[PDB]
Design a protein around this ligand. Structure first.
Ligand SMILES: Nc1ncnc2c1ncn2[C@@H]1O[C@H](COP(=O)(O)OP(=O)(O)O)[C@@H](O)[C@H]1O
Ligand SMILES: Nc1ncnc2c1ncn2[C@@H]1O[C@H](COP(=O)(O)OP(=O)(O)O)[C@@H](O)[C@H]1O
Ligand SMILES: [Mg+2]
Ligand SMILES: [Mg+2]
Lengths: 160, 74, 371, 118, 371
């Protein structure tokens, strides 16, 4: 969404040098970026980042949607920067505790995924296929019929 | 742990350790000043005990969460 | 609101709301401070584990019961036990619930007065009432007469009751109980090589006693049989392996009840103090007491005691009277079931010691009309 | 699954969180002022004689003692249940975080970048 | 600021800043003065090469370890080693960093007091703390119970811990370790013709031991097999050629751990001192210690030791208990990883021995509450 566009706008130069080193290493002369996912993963490892082998597989399986290997550096670098963590721990657990204190309108020691739906609807936000279903599925991820405090934590932990 | 000590502590804070003082034995302006001062101090104490009740509510909610986590954890 | 039927006991604290069938939370009454040094930092080590938590960390604790023989010897620990019982095992604040404690007969006054003072000052209950542990066990049987032998873990007492009129001059309280049987078993196990010394290993010996020991119908014949055959030797696996084999220690441990000379006590067994308690009663209610002998308490759960006791009393009693021993399967919680029934009665609802009454007469109110 | 979904969800969640934060803060301020007003009854600058001054002064001294004892008592209750809450926090951490304690590390950071030392 | 987690050890000094995964600089702890005369002028020849520099010029030096068995026997050399560690391998002045040394259990007091006095007077650190080398190795495993066998290069010690409460009466410290195995290997190599005598060639024998030796699962069968076939003879190239072939010396060198009678020591092997250390513990925590036996230290890196030790303990222990031996792949640096974790804790941040405290009570502060 707009987050990746903004991140593109606010390109950090310290990471920009690493990405251009990747450009130098992978590109072999007017190279249109065939997306060597092995090369991309080794580049991520070399540049100090610690991508998971699962992240490596995700990058393997989420590339070359054009089918021609050669990929615009725009979306490639969007994937590269977002795969790299750029955030601070996603708020504080005490902050989350106080927020849940606000959000326990049911006052039953927890909140509800249905309560989450009602509050988000009260926020007047778009609900779609990307919304609605998996939002409540992962809010009450353990599927207790309601979102416990730890469930609310694990729904959106480490996210800005 | 010698609940006699706890009882005597409570009673001292009730009567001795609390700022208890006979003061309505003074001249006019001074008496008004002292009355205003004590009333304002007790008003601040009203604010303090209102927050005491508020945070006690919060602790009750926290123990509700605590029991919830306990039950979900076993 | 509902009443809290607590039952301090000595060895197992049994509690629960009035009007149910079984206590909600049953857990040993032990408070054990750690005894070693402790090197891990931030492990969250507390200073005293009470209740059932200290039966799992007992390897590094020094468990000590706060109730010796009915009486309470360590008031701080007992207060800690009560606080745990109210807040963590039932999770009901005591400010909104009447309480019904239980107390053995013939106990020191100061114990009862301190109990009521604690309940009214520290926990600040609305109203509490103290009842004798045998009348409740008679409630639970659904009788109204009968002589009840409530052999707990601290003290064994034998209260005869007729038509609802208790006979205060015929109560025979004897201080042999389950704890002395545990100590005697731990002392006779040393005759095979197994030495249990630590206060934590007393729990292991208690488990051995519960699971293996039984009361012999005839003592001499069993002693002769166990000394010739080997059909009695039952084995048991310690908490670490190294199984042990108990021979004629099986029926010698609970035999102490009928021959208190084994542990050096002078008095007569539980088979003869019941007959003496009956004979102190009037001559016209002895038949009913003979026919309605009630057993209660934990220690009367030994397999085969309801027959040995009947045989002994039939030997002592006149040949014409019929001797019947009531041994309900819910023996252990009989006192608490009776307590629940008593607290659920409408006629009893005005016998509680209301707090304003305590404020006017002090803790000595318990000995007064509100008994 | 698109992470833009999570980004949008967190935007809405942050909006809800801030709204409820300001809402509860404002509620607390208003209710606090209301309670103090209805309880801290004003003291007046005129209308009482010296004898009336003394009378109302000692009456409010008694009222001050009443509310001071009440608030100290409830403060003691707050402290004791707060100790209890702390104990329960320790216990629940022992329930959950006992094995998570060693998990905290910041490792394999620099030595991986030290191949030119030799 | 960040803390310096130094770990003196005996054989390899491991150091690094708190909060990482691996020590920053690991180098042998040897200080070797030159022994020949020296004829080139202006070559810039120093008077003592310490650390990893003296493992490259060892041909003309006389290396001598400053730590014999845990204890420190030559304080000037140890001070030199510490100075090198701080200034050249980490390049951080000690005036701005807390330090966390490590010490074996049951060591002389004077050693620890002199260590703290040096750290506070010569290097002038802000605050230092001394920790037992086994508790850290238990930290690194992420456990909170378990009995850890930390077979270093100087001394092998076996500290049992339960629920964070260390058991001081069950620590079994044995002075057989990697150095004695090196000497015994150097002594049995002479049975084929290879003679290593110089203190420099002890390093070559150590390399042979590290690269070739392994612990046999069953000793007699291996002795019989190596005496008939020749499938075990592995060759190794000395620092100058002349390859050597090690026969049944391969599994006879590390077998000394389980039979200390080989080097004339009386005591029982590391397979039986662990069982003895367990049996001294209370009867209720033996199952947990059986299930969480932890290995650490360098010398426990022999290929095939985690199976031999488990077989031996299973032979000794009761048949019902489950015996499990935790052998993490990062065994060598386990103590230092645990030290980093401990220094990174917030709860531990107030246990350091602050300098003003030392100024008020002298070096004997270490035995006091700040342990
Ligand atoms: N199934 C059993 N078999 C034999 N003895 C038992 C059994 N259950 C409990 N006991 C003994 O009874 C004691 C518990 O008695 P209990 O009735 O709880 O005492 P209290 O009157 O204090 O509640 C235990 O200490 C144990 O020694
Ligand atoms: N891979 C290995 N195989 C066998 N033995 C080893 C190995 N690595 C180290 N050792 C032995 O362990 C010793 C190092 O032990 P270490 O844990 O560094 O001792 P310390 O506790 O003093 O740090 C060396 O002297 C060596 O004999
Ligand atoms: Mg009883
Ligand atoms: Mg070591």
């Amino acid at each position: 969404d707009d987050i990746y566009k903004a991140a593109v706008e606010q390109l950090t130069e310290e990471q920009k040098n690493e990405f251009k080193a990747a450009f130098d290493i992978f590109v072999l002369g007017a190279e249109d970026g065939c997306i060597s996912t092995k090369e991309l993963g080794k580049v991520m490892r070399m540049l100090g980042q610690n991508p998971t082998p699962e992240e490596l597989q995700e990058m393997i399986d989420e590339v070359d949607e054009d089918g021609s290997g050669t990929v615009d550096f725009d979306e490639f670098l969007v994937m590269m920067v977002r795969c790299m963590k750029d955030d601070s721990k996603g708020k504080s657990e005490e902050e989350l505790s106080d927020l849940f204190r606000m959000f326990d309108k049911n006052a039953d020691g927890y909140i509800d995924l249905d309560e989450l739906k009602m509050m988000l609807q009260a926020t007047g936000e778009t609900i779609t296929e990307d919304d609605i279903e998996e939002l409540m599925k992962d809010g009450d991820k353990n599927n207790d019929g309601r979102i416990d405090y730890d469930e609310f934590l694990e729904f959106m932990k480490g996210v800005e | 742990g010698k609940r006699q000590t706890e009882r005597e502590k409570k009673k001292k804070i009730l009567a001795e350790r609390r700022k208890a003082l006979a003061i309505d034995h003074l001249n006019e302006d001074q008496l008004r000043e002292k009355a205003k001062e004590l009333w304002q101090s007790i008003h601040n104490l009203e604010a303090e005990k209102f927050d005491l009740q508020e945070k006690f509510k919060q602790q009750k909610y926290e123990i509700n969460v605590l029991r919830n986590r306990i039950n979900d954890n076993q | 609101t509902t009443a809290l039927v607590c039952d301090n006991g000595s060895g197992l604290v049994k509690a629960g709301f009035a009007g149910d069938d079984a206590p909600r939370a049953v857990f040993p009454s032990i408070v054990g401070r750690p005894r070693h040094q402790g090197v891990m930092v931030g492990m969250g080590q507390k200073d005293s584990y009470v209740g059932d938590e200290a039966q799992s960390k007992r390897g590094i604790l020094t468990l000590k019961y706060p109730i010796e023989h009915g009486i309470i010897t360590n008031w701080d620990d007992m207060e800690k036990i009560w606080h745990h019982t109210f807040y963590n095992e039932l999770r009901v604040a005591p400010e909104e619930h009447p309480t019904l404690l239980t107390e053995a007969p013939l106990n020191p006054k100061a114990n009862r007065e301190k109990m009521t003072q604690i309940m009214f000052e520290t926990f600040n209950v609305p109203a509490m009432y103290v009842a004798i542990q045998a009348v409740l066990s008679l409630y639970a049987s659904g009788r109204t007469t009968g002589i009840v032998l409530d052999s707990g873990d601290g003290v064994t007492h034998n209260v005869p009751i007729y038509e609802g009129y208790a006979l205060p001059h015929a109560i025979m309280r004897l201080d042999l109980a389950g704890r002395d049987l545990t100590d005697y078993l731990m002392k006779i196990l040393t005759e095979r090589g197994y030495s249990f010394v630590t206060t934590a290993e007393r729990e292991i010996v208690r488990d051995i006693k519960e699971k293996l020991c039984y009361v012999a119908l005839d003592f001499e014949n069993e002693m002769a049989t166990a000394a010739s055959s080997s059909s009695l030797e039952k084995s048991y696996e310690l908490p670490d392996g190294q199984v042990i084999t108990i021979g004629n220690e099986r029926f010698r441990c609970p035999e102490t009840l009928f021959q208190p000379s084994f542990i050096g006590m002078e008095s007569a067994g539980i088979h003869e103090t019941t007959y003496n308690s009956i004979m102190k009663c009037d001559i016209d209610i002895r038949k009913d007491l003979y026919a309605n002998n009630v057993l209660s308490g934990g220690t009367t759960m030994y397999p085969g005691i309801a027959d040995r006791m009947q045989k002994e009393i039939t030997a002592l009693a006149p040949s014409t009277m019929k001797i019947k021993i009531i041994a309900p399967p819910e023996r252990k919680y009989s006192v608490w079931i009776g307590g629940s029934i008593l607290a659920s009665l409408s006629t009893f609802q005005q016998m509680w010691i209301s707090k304003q009454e305590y404020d006017e007469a002090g803790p000595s109110i318990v000995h007064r009309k509100c008994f | 699954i698109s992470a833009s979904r999570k980004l949008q969800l967190k935007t809405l969640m942050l909006q809800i969180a801030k709204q409820e934060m300001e809402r509860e803060a404002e509620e607390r301020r208003g209710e606090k002022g209301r309670v103090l007003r209805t309880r801290c009854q004003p003291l007046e600058l005129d209308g009482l004689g010296f004898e009336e001054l003394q009378d109302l002064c000692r009456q409010l001294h008694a009222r001050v003692d009443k509310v001071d004892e009440e608030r100290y008592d409830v403060e003691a209750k707050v402290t004791k249940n707060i100790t209890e809450i702390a104990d329960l926090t320790q216990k629940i951490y022992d329930l959950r975080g006992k094995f998570k304690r060693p998990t905290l590390r910041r490792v394999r950071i620099s030595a991986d970048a030290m191949m030119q030392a030799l």
